[PDB]
RNA sequence: CGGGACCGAGGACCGCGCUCUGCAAGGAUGCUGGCGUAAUGGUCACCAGCGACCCGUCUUGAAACACGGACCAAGGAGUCAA
RNA sequence: GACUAAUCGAACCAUCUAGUAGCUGGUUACCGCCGAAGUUUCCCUCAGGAUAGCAGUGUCGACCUUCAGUUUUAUGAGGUAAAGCGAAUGAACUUUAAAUAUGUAAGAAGCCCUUGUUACUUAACUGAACGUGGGCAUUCGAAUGUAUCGACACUAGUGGGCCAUUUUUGGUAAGCAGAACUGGCGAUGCGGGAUGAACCGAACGCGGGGUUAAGGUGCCGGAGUGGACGCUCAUCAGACACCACAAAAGGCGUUAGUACAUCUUGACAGCAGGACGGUGGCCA
RNA sequence: GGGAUGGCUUGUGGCGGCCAAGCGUUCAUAGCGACGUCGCUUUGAUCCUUCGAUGUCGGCUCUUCCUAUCAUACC
């Protein structure tokens, strides 16, 4: 994989660019289920 | 192709710990220098015994003159060359008074009547007809006949191209 | 020409056509005469010549 | 086999894992390590363009990489020269400390008695037949 | 043609003054001579520092050379191609033999009251022809605003 | 050992040399003839052999297209201040 | 949307006003010294930006340290050719080992040893890191080249152009389209390709002599109706061809060959003769 | 303020299968394959199935050329 010095700069100590797609995934992921919740707490005060 | 000389010429591979003294390969190359010469022989082992000019070594180069050049002598040569359709076998005949001059009038006689350039051509062997019965061509089998005598029609004589204008219309039987 | 034959070149000191140099031959020198074949011509000298 | 920084290595795509992948540039590449991870490790290579260099990082699994043998020929002959040089003051004897190219070869003379040579056709006769 | 992949250089460096001070051409000459007939390298500095220009030619001040003096330095003679210039921060001026291309009227009031000598260029040549037993000095050259702006 | 062509930079001596009374050795001298003026040389006009697109300007990578130019004189466009 | 003094989808006159334009046009003596460039990297694109890189003038610093689009050596990648298997085993076999270009490294600024600490690490004073002291100048540890240094300052154009060889990725009925390196051109004259952006040779101060390159030597046209051996006759031959037409194509054109076959027990071509009987075989 | 495919084309369909002289291969018997051929595209009928302009053609008047010939000449 190619690294940008800036991005491999400001990277965390420990962290490795094999899972910042994992990391972007699962932020996405919790988005998701945060507004699903939202949903299904509305639906159930209605 | 060139004022041909023929070669002997002696190679081996460089002595190594296993093989202390080697094989020595002997060919015979028609070739204007020694340098095209040994090039040759490289070239020629690469395609058969897989020895390279780098792991390898010249142990002799000798010109190889012809033994009588008076003598007039029937030559057959077998060689192979190559077409955009591959490889062809020929077998031709000339009439000559040494081997380099029968390599040379191969040479022209291909490029004169089938386009074969010299890297193209593989001589694979010359040798002297021994006897009148070996000639198998006619255009040799003509010439070797009993009694030959014949005469020159039409002889076109040599006018120096300097002199423009003649006195007189030239003949043409001498 | 292209970079290579160019820098052997110069390294050589053949800047212009029709220059000439001795060269000792070793194969660190043989090799580089042999990259620059297309642009030279090289032989061994008599003393004649030299 | 564990890598730190600063070590040399070479990357070496190795397996039916070389098919397709997008960077074939780095295979057969040499650098230096400047990250280490437990299956992956950072690598700077240097690519030319016209005159000047640029650098590059990249990240290799370490199943891709080996330990390079770059250096081990100068400390070898670092050493060597060192006991070398100690052994011809004691012995009071110059050595030669430096490599040279490989030399013309010499005359020599070659016997051919018990190894007449074979003459060759530029086609071999037992392939005609 | 002639391939020529590298270029020759011109030169980089001052090979003359670029002022019209009649007296510092005649120091210029007087050192170019000097620079051809001796082996001194010091008179070669000189003169290539005569050719520089102002702030290639920052000033000394009396605390700069008083610190210089310090350590086996006392008896030599101090020269400076720059103006030497008086530091009221320095209250005792030792004793000392200065060499300047020129001096302010209270540095060498100073120099003259401690009891040192003050000299000219061309006085550094007629008494120290080679240049034995001084000590060459040069002022802060990035002690400058634009500098400090770079 | 012959035959021919082009050239003669420098301007006391100094040097390397040699075949050493001197020389072909760190760059041409010697002898002779005609003329001493338009003879050599030069300028202009024309013929002859060979050579040779119409200038800016624009465009893009470049050409082509396009635009300006009947001719001449005089003005005529990177200045001053902070 | 007609007319309102040849003026009207808002008249005419003067002023603000030398209004603004990123678009068009133009922008004035000579010589000398240097001398360029087209995704490098980042930013939401087009009606986008910076920025790397390449240049010139000044200087200064010991213009000190040496460095290098190159080879060699050691080791990677390419094990890929190849030799053998009377070595084992069976491109995937190996003792050995290709070609093209290609990465890394090749010294005193270096190498090694020793002592401690560690806040790293290790079962661990163990490795490694940081310091400490010492040894190694007997050669400074390949070749070749080396008017090729460094650091500032200020200034300027160009920074997603065209063509081509090679490598590579895709395609089309056929065309072709992306990248990477390199070379050329835009900026460039000269000799040759009759002619000319992209071809070949060769790069340029003013002159004289000599010799060549590519290309040429029947005349135009400087140089050969030059030499040797052959081939070819075209009812618009061919002479700068490679691509297409276009096929394993059609030729009782002409040569040189290869294979198979017949031949004094008479081949191939002819001429003179035979070419018979069951039998008008069966069905229709 | 700029700007205004081309030595092309012609007379014989496509798709699928088969055969096939040959090319290759003969430690694998695969893969190309001209010539062909086979299948999809009313007893001389029906006349009660016309299936979309973005692309533009014209006419005089007059001359010449090509041949890929309708007529005239010959075969």
Redesign the pocket.
Known sequence: IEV?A?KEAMRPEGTSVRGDKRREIRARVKKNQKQMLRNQRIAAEK | MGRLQEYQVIGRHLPTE?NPNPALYRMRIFAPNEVVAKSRFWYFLRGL??V?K?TGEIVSVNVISEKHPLKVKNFGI?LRYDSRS?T??????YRETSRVAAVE?MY??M????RARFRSIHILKVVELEKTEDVK???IKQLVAKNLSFPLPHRVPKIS??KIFSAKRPSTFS | ????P???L????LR??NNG?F??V???????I??VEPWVAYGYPNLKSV | RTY?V?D?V?????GAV?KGMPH?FY??????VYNVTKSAVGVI??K???????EKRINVRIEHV?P???????????????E???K??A????????????MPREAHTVSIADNKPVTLAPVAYETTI | ???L??????????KAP?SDNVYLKLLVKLYRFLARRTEAPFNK?VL??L???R??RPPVSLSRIARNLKNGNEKKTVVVVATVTDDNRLLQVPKMEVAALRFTAKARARIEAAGGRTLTLDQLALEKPTGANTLLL?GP?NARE??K??
Do not use: C
Request: charged fraction near 35%.
């Open positions: 940008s800036a | 296993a015994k897989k390279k780098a077998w591959g062809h076998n020929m077998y031709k005949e009038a022209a006689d490029a004169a009547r089938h061509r006619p255009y191209t300097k | 020409i292209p970079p290579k160019r820098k052997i110069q390294l050589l000191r212009q056509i140099v060269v000792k070793t194969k660190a020198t043989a090799e580089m042999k990259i | 730190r600063g040399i070479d990357i070496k795509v190795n070389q074939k295979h057969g590449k040499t650098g230096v290579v240097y030319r363009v016209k005159h000047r260099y640029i080996k390079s043998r770059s250096r081990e020929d100068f400390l070898r002959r670092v050493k060597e020269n060192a070398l040089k100690k011809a003051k012995e009071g004897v110059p050595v030669q400390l430096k490599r040279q190219p490989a | 043609g002639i391939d992949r590298w270029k020759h250089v011109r030169s980089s460096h001052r670029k500095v290539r520092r050719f520089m220009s702030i290639n040069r050259k634009a500098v702006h770079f």
